[PDB]
RNA sequence: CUAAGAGUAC
C-alpha cells in the first residue's frame, strides 16, 4: 500500500525485459491501474510522485507537509528545468515488441509499504482431518487444520439454486453422518443394537 | 401545497401533461380527511399503510404496502422485478 | 529509540490505554424525551478526591 | 517567560486564535496555483496556532500532502501504516519477541513531512521508494 | 508502538446503535487526530492524541 | 550488406551507437537478449562456517550472489546441470572463500577485494570480482565490530538473467527510434501546445526535422534506432552486444536444427 | 540496514559508491545532487538508491557482540 | 463446518474463461474427489495410483469395497495395487472439475456460482474479471472459498444448475449481472472510435487471438493507398453471427455525426462507439441479446473473445493517468473563481436580507430553516456550475475524461471535486454545527454564518485544503464511515430475517405458490 | 510454496520437444506450430520475418498465458508452398541478417581509439 | 465488377469534428442537381480541401473482368490488376439502409467499417445500387 | 396409493421437463453408470458418465419416470420418454 | 476450557 490508502495485492510479476521502458532504459518496479485514481480521488498520490521525481533528480528532500505553500505548478517548473515533461508523463515503449506506446505513461518514484498480510499465511485447504470431540464436526481454524464454516446464508443461496442433493451432501457426507437405530412403537433412540 | 404534473388523455387522443395542485400533510387522519368536501375521495393516499389497511381494507393495505416497498427500492434508482415484492 | 512508558508483567510489555469519562463536579442539564414524565434533569456527579 | 500558553477545551471557548501568524496578524498579483485563503477581516486575536499541521496524530503525520486527499483515504492510511513492515527497534537481535518482521533495506521517503523527524521516521523507516508507472499495461 | 502508547478509549458499548459519540466533535480540534480512528465497531470510540 | 551500425561514443562501460537499416523486431529482440540471455558467472552457493556479525546468514548470501565476477571466458565453463560431477567441480564452478576478522578497535569493513579464489582456474579468465572505484575496495559486503568474525566459502556457477537477475550483465539499455515522431507512433498529451511542452530528445540533432507542410508519409517504416548499452562489469561493454547477437543467432539456429531433425524422423 | 549491492530498477552496481558518497558530503562539502552526479549516478533510479539509504548497521554495531573471541 | 473446502486470496486473470477458476497446485493436491473404478476409466485411475499423492496429478487414497482405506503414502512399500471394479480412487482434483466457489458475505445466489478447475502454479485463486461483479469481489486482499462435490449426482447438478453461464441473466432484475469492466471497458471505447485504424501486422495478431475465428481476413475498410482496418471492424469478429442491436442515444440519427448510439447488423458494428451502455450489465444490451438469442455458452464465449482482443489492443496501445489530467487551463480557473465569488456574493445578500428580517419564511418552516435551505441550494448549484465549467474545459485526450466517458470509473462529481471545487461539507444532512458556543471553531467569531465558517470548501483537491476546510472535510468523512459501518450490520440483520420468513415458499406443479 | 522453479522458463522439460506442428482445419494450407520454452523474443522476430515473405498469406503468434513459457505461431502460405519451408526461409534470413550485423559492429568497434 | 454509380462532385464543406484523422464532407454533384453526397474520409491518408472536384464511383467489385468477399483478403501481389489502379482512394463497405426521400429522390446509406456515407438522388440513376457490399473509389 | 395416483388419461401438468428434473435425471443416470449399470446407447468413445447420460437423454433411452407430487399428496407419473426436453 | 484484546474482507 502507498501512504494514501491505495492497498492492493500482486497480480503477476514480469521480468525486466517484459516491462515497459522509457528511452533511458528505466523500467518500473511497480505498475498500478489508472482506474484506482479517479473514484478514490487520491490526488496527493500523484502530487507526491511528482515531488519525489523532482527530489530524486535534484538531490534535495521533498517537503510534503500539509499546509505549506507548495503548489503543483512549482514542482512542475522544477521538473521541467531538469529536462522532463513537467506533468510527469514519459514516452514509454512496449516491452514485447519495442514499439512506442500510443499513450505516454505517468511515471515516477513513490513510497510503498509492505503490509503484514501475505498469502502464505492465509492459504488453507482441508479434505479430512481432526474432528471436534463433542459434535464430531471439523475443528476450527487453519492452525488446527480446521474446516470452513458452511453458514446459514450459504445454505440459503444453495436452496435458491435448487440444489437439494448438494446441500444434503454438504451437511451430512462432508461434515457428520451418523447411523442410529430407532424403535417403531416409540420414536426414541433407546434401542440396544448388538450388531456383532 | 405543491404543483404536480400528471398525464391526462387529451380529447384528441394523446396523453398531455396536465398540472394539478396537490396537498401534502404532516400527520395522518385519513378517516376524517377523506370525508372533507372539495377533495377527491377516491385518489387519497397515505404513507401509513396501517391506516390505509384499517380504513380501506386488507387488499388496499396490500397495495399500499407494495407501493411503499417499491418506493424504498426505487429511491436509489435500483429496479427490482415486480414478482419479488409482490 | 525506545521511549518507555510501559510495564513489564511476566515478561510481557503492557500499556495502559487512557480511559475517557465524564468530568465530575459539573452541573449538566439535559432535556428528556416526550414519554418520560420529567421534562428536564439537572445532575451533578459529585465526587471528592 | 509568558511566551506560550497551555489551553484546554474549556478555555478554548473564550479565546480567538489565528491560524497562521503571517497571514492573520499583520493588517492585510497572487499565484493562481495557491489555494484560496481568507483574512477573516477581524483583528482582536488573543492567541496564535504554533502550526496547523500539529492537529494530526502520529500515524497521520506520515502522510504526504494529506490536504490534497479525501478524508476516508487518510483514515485508511492511518490505520494501515501500523501494519507496515520496517525496523521496530534497533535491538531486535537481543530480544525474544513472539513475532518480528524486518525489512532488508528500509529507505527514508523522498517526499517527507516536517513533523516526521520528531517521530524518528527517517531513522527507522517502514517502506521503500519504488519506481511506479500508472498504466493499463497487460490487464493483470 | 507510538500510536499505541498515545491511545484513548471511550467505554460506550461498541454494539450500541447510537452514532453521536462516534462523530468527530468540534472541540476535538487540536486534541485528538481528526483522521486516526479504527474502522470497525470502534470507529470514533477509540481516539489518538 | 544488411544491418548497418555507426557508434557515437565508446567507453569502458558504455557504448552508444546507431543501428540503421534493420527491422524494429530485430532491434527489440537484440535488446531483450542483451538484457536476459547472456551467460555470466555469479556466486550461487554459500557455506557459512562462522558468522558473529549483526547480519543474517541469508542476508549476506543474498549480498554475495549480487557481487559481479569476471566472465570474459565464461564460455569455457559448463553449466552445473550438464556436468558429470556430484555437486561442483573444476569444470563447472569457481570456489571463492571469504574470511574476515574484527581485530581492529574501530569498525572493519569487509569489502569484495577480500574474496580469495581457492579452486584452480585452469588458465581461464573467470572468477575475479570486478573492482571499479579508485580506492581499490570492491562492493562493501559487511561491517565488523571488534571481536566479530565471518568465515564462509562460496561456489559460483554460470547462469543467465532469466533464472535470476544476479546473472545479468547489461544494466540499463537505452533504446529510441524516430525522435521527431514522423511515423506518428505516439499521440502527444498536451494542454496548450504539444511542441513546447514535450522536450526534444538529444537524438533529434541526427535527423531532419519535418517540413510542417508535407503530407503524412504512410509508406514509411521504422528503422534507424539509437541505442546505448551499459555494462555492469562482468564482461566488456562491446562483448555484451557481440554475445547478444551471437545468442540470438544461436536461438534461431536451434529452431532450424529442431525443425530439420524432426523433419528427418 | 547496509547499502544495497545493486540498484533495484536497472541493476547498476551502487554498493561500492557509499563510502565515496559520504566522503564527498563530508570532506568536499558537496551537496547531495553534485555528489551523486560525481559518482556517475545519472538515472534517478540509482539516485534514489544512494540518496534515500538509511545506514542502520552502525546502530547494530553499537551493541557488544554476543560471541566475542 | 464442512470438509473438502479451501480458502485463499484471489487475483484476476484476463487469460481465463468466464466459467474457469484457477486453483493453486497445493490446494489441488490437498482436495480430492472419489471416483468409482469402472471399466471405462480403469487405466487412468491405475496410472494416478501409480503416480501417488506427492505429485500432481495423482491419487491420495484407495477406498476398497471392504471399507479398508489404502493410504498411498507408505503404500509403495507394498508394491503396485491392482484395482477392481467397484472400488474408489480418492484422487487429486484435475482440470474441468465442477467446484462451488463462494465469497463469504453471500447476499444472493450469484455469489455462489460453480466454476471449472484450472490448476495453476501459484498461491492465489484466479478468476475472470467479469465474474467479479456478482461476487462483489476486488483484489485488494479479498479471500474466497472453494467446495468440492464428492459424488456424481452433486457434481451433475452443480454443473447443470449453478454454472456461471447459466447465471448471466439474473432473476433479480431480469437483466444480466455480468458485463465488461474497467480496463476492457475503457479499451473497447478507445478501440471503436472512428479515428482508430489498425495496420495489417496487428490485425493478424488480433484475429489470431480470437479463439473461434473462422480463418478469413475481412476486407479492409480502406484499400488504397494503404490497407487499414477499423477498430469496429476487428471487434466485430468477436460478436457472433446473426446478432442485431439498434439503440438510439440523444441526438443520434441514421447518420451519426457524433458517433453515439449503436447499430449492429448481423454481428457487424455498423456504427456507434461501444461503451458501458452496450457491453455493460444493462438490459437490452449486447450481453442480454446474445444470451437470449444464442444461449449462455455462446455469451460466455463472447465475454472471453471480447476481453482477449480488447486486452491485446490496449496492451499494445497504452493508457495512463496523471496529475496533469486534474489541471484546467488559466481562463477556466478564472471563470471557476468568478462563479464561486458570485455565488458567495448571492449568499451574502441573502444573509443581509435575513438579518434585516426582510426575509419571509416559507410556508411550513421557520425563518432559520428557510435561510439554511437557500444558502445550501446556492452553494450546491455553485459547485455544480463550477464542475460543469471544468468538465467542458477538459479535452478529449484527458484520461479522467476518457474513463468517465467509457463508464469504466469515475463520475462528473469526481472531476468537479478534483479540479474545480470540493463543495459543501454536511453532517447529519445539515451544515457544520456550532460545536463551540455559537461558532464552529475557535478561529471564527461568534454567530458567523458565512460559507467558509460552516464548512464550504472552495478549494479543489489540486489546490489543497486550508486547515479549517481540512477539519470540516474530516468531520464529513467520519460521518460517512460511521454510516457505512451501521448500514452493513443493519442490512445483514434485515436480510437474515427476510430469508427466514420466506424460506418455505415454493412454486408447485399446479403453478400455485 | 507454489512458485515454480525459474529454470523451467528455458530448459526443455522431459518428454517434450522444441517444436510441434499441427495442421489447421480452418483454412487450407495452414499450420500451427507450438514453440516450447520460448517467449516474445523469438516469436516477434519470426513473425516479422515471415511477414516479409511474399508467398505467406497469414502469419501470427500468441503467448496464451504469461505463466508458461511457450507460444503458438499460425502460418498460412499460398498453394504449393509448404509452411515449413516458409519457416525455414524466415530463420535463414534472420541468421544472415544477424551475422552481417555482428560483422559490421565488430568492424566499427575496431575503429575506436577512446574505448 | 461494373461501376454501379459514377459522378463528379464539388465539396462544399469539410468538418473535422472531434477527430484528427477522419473528416465528414458534403458534396454536390456537378452534373445532376438532385444528387448530393455526405461522406467520412480518412484525411490523414487522403487530404481533401473545400471546393475540391472529386470523381466518385461505386462498384460491386474491383476486377476488370465481369463477375463469373467470401474469399479471405490477400495482400496485393506485384502485377495484380484491378479497378483501384485508376483511382486514388478506395474503401469497402456495406449498404445498411434504403430510404424514400420523396416521390423521385431516394437515399442510400453505406458504412465502410464505421465511416458513414449517404448518397441521395433520383431513382433514374441511383437504381443500380442495391443492398449488398460495395467498393467506393475516389479520384481527384 | 390407488386414490393418490392420478390416472394417465387426465394428467394436468406440463409436458415439458423442468430444469430440476433434467438435472436430477442426469445426476441419477451418471451415478448409475459410474456403478457399472448397463448402457442403453452405443458409445462413441466417451468415458465420462455425465456425458454418457447426456447422450442417453438426447435420444431418449433413459428408463426412468418422474413422480410429480401435487401439494395435496397426489402424484402424476411422467416417463422420461414422453417428456419434451425443450431446454 | 473460558475470557479478553488486535484485527482482515463486506
Ligand atoms: Mg476488496
Ligand atoms: Zn420402543
Ligand atoms: Zn562439474
Ligand atoms: Zn538504476
Swiss-Prot record, chain B:
Domain of life here? Eukaryota
Glycyl lysine isopeptide (Lys-Gly) (interchain with G-Cter in ubiquitin): where is this cross-link? 67
Modification(s) after translation: The tandem 7 residues repeats in the C-terminal domain (CTD) can be highly phosphorylated. The phosphorylation activates Pol II. Phosphorylation occurs mainly at residues 'Ser-2' and 'Ser-5' of the heptapeptide repeat. The phosphorylated form of Pol II appears to carry, on average, one phosphate per repeat. The phosphorylation state is believed to result from the balanced action of site-specific CTD kinases and phosphatases, and a 'CTD code' that specifies the position of Pol II within the transcription cycle has been proposed.
Question: Where does it localize?
Answer: Nucleus
Role, per record = DNA-dependent RNA polymerase catalyzes the transcription of DNA into RNA using the four ribonucleoside triphosphates as substrates. Largest and catalytic component of RNA polymerase II which synthesizes mRNA precursors and many functional non-coding RNAs. Forms the polymerase active center together with the second largest subunit. Pol II is the central component of the basal RNA polymerase II transcription machinery. During a transcription cycle, Pol II, general transcription factors and the Mediator complex assemble as the preinitiation complex (PIC) at the promoter.
Q: Which family does it belong to?
A: Belongs to the RNA polymerase beta' chain family.
Please identify the protein, giving its name as recorded: DNA-directed RNA polymerase II subunit RPB1
- Could you say which residues of the full protein are shown? 1284 to 1369 of 1733
Curated annotation (Swiss-Prot), chain H:
Q: Where is this cross-link: Glycyl lysine isopeptide (Lys-Gly) (interchain with G-Cter in ubiquitin)?
A: 352
Q: Give residues annotated as binding Mg(2+) 1.
A: 138, 140, 142
Q: How is it modified after translation?
A: The tandem 7 residues repeats in the C-terminal domain (CTD) can be highly phosphorylated. The phosphorylation activates Pol II. Phosphorylation occurs mainly at residues 'Ser-2' and 'Ser-5' of the heptapeptide repeat. The phosphorylated form of Pol II appears to carry, on average, one phosphate per repeat. The phosphorylation state is believed to result from the balanced action of site-specific CTD kinases and phosphatases, and a 'CTD code' that specifies the position of Pol II within the transcription cycle has been proposed.
Where it sits in the cell: the answer is: Nucleus
Additional information = Mutagenesis experiments demonstrate that the minimum viable CTD contains eight consensus Y-S-P-T-S-P-[A-S-N-G] heptapeptide repeats. Identical and simultaneous substitutions in a number of consecutive repeats are lethal: 'Ser-2' -> 'Ala-2' (14 repeats), 'Ser-5' -> 'Ala-5' (15 repeats), '2-Ser-Pro-Thr-Ser-5'-> '2-Ala-Pro-Thr-Ala-5' (10 repeats), 'Ser-2'-> 'Glu-2' (15 repeats), 'Ser-5' -> 'Glu-5' (12 repeats), '2-Ser-Pro-3' -> '2-Pro-Ser-3' (15 repeats) and 'Tyr-1' -> 'Phe-1' (12 repeats).
Entry domain remark: The C-terminal domain (CTD) serves as a platform for assembly of factors that regulate transcription initiation, elongation, termination and mRNA processing.
This protein is called what?
DNA-directed RNA polymerase II subunit RPB1
UniProtKB/Swiss-Prot annotation, chain J:
Instruction: Please state what the protein is called.
Output: DNA-directed RNA polymerases I, II, and III subunit RPABC3
Gene3D superfamilies the record matches = Nucleic acid-binding proteins (2.40.50.140)
What molecular function does GO assign, one term?
Answer: DNA binding
Pfam families associated with the record: RNA_pol_Rpb8 (PF03870)
SUPFAM superfamilies in alphabetical order: Nucleic acid-binding proteins
Q: What else is known?
A: Present with 6210 molecules/cell in log phase SD medium.
Chain positions with Phosphothreonine modification: 67
UniProtKB/Swiss-Prot annotation, chain K:
Q: What is its main location?
A: cytoplasm
> GO terms for biological process?
nucleolar large rRNA transcription by RNA polymerase I; ribosome biogenesis; RNA-templated transcription; termination of RNA polymerase I transcription; termination of RNA polymerase III transcription; transcription by RNA polymerase I; transcription by RNA polymerase II; transcription by RNA polymerase III
Q: What domain of life is recorded for the organism?
A: Eukaryota
Region Leucine-zipper, annotated ranges: 43-64
Q: What Gene Ontology cellular-component terms does the record carry?
A: cytoplasm; nucleoplasm; nucleus; RNA polymerase I complex; RNA polymerase II, core complex; RNA polymerase III complex
What does the UniProt entry say about where the protein is found?
Cytoplasm; Nucleus
Gene Ontology MF terms in the entry:
DNA binding; DNA-directed RNA polymerase activity
Q: Which UniProt keyword terms apply here? A: Cytoplasm, DNA-directed RNA polymerase, Nucleus, Phosphoprotein, Ribosome biogenesis, Transcription
Transmembrane stretches, by residue range?
Answer: none
Q: How does it assemble?
A: Component of the RNA polymerase I (Pol I), RNA polymerase II (Pol II) and RNA polymerase III (Pol III) complexes. Component of the RNA polymerase I (Pol I) complex consisting of 14 subunits: RPA135, RPA190, RPC40, RPA14, RPB5, RPO26, RPA43, RPB8, RPA12, RPB10, RPC19, RPC10, RPA49 and RPA34. The complex is composed of a horseshoe-shaped core containing ten subunits (RPA135, RPA190, RPB5, RPO26, RPB8, RPB10, RPC10, RPA12, RPC19 and RPC40) where RPA135 and RPA190 form the DNA-binding cleft.
Provide the family line: Belongs to the archaeal Rpo6/eukaryotic RPB6 RNA polymerase subunit family.
Q: What else is known?
A: Present with 6090 molecules/cell in log phase SD medium.
